[PDB]
Design a binder for these strands. Structure first.
Length: 95
RNA sequence: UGGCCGGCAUGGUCCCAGCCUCCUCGCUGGCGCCGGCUGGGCAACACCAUUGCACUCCGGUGGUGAAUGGGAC
């Protein structure tokens, strides 16, 4: 069951050998051109590694990002993007 | 030596170069042989496992079972 459009894109299949600080940096390097980014959440725990939550200010940015960067080779692996199942807190504290 | 001990071997103090290491990365650490017991930590590194939807930091295991020569007194 696919997911509905969201402010936050959920990326997975990421290179797990990349430190947290660097991944957020590089992800911002390539995703900032799609619109303002409120935050990029990354955890290297057993359950959350290889995944990231990019939080865009406007849904159109997330959408563009999702369509434009699907399968993009990043740290030698094709990035798999989806919309986040639910809003991130940063988005709730507003809209 | 991360903490502790048993055996053996070994003239000393320095000075230069090379090398080693999970646990005070270097010049007021170390770089003989052999044996047993043991603490901490996944922080770095490595290996294993993991394709996982969060907004609570949080899988596991490994290492020192290491590293040479030269010079001056």
């Amino acid at each position: 069951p696919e997911t509905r459009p969201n402010h936050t894109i959920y990326i997975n299949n990421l290179n797990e050998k990349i430190k947290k600080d660097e991944l957020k940096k590089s992800l911002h390097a390539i995703f900032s051109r799609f619109g303002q980014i409120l935050d990029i959440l990354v955890s290297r725990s057993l359950k959350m590694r290889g995944q990231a939550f990019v939080i865009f200010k406007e849904v159109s940015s997330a959408t563009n990002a999702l369509r434009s960067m699907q399968g993009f080779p990043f740290y030698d692996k094709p990035m798999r993007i989806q919309y986040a199942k639910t809003d991130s807190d940063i988005i709730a504290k507003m809209k």
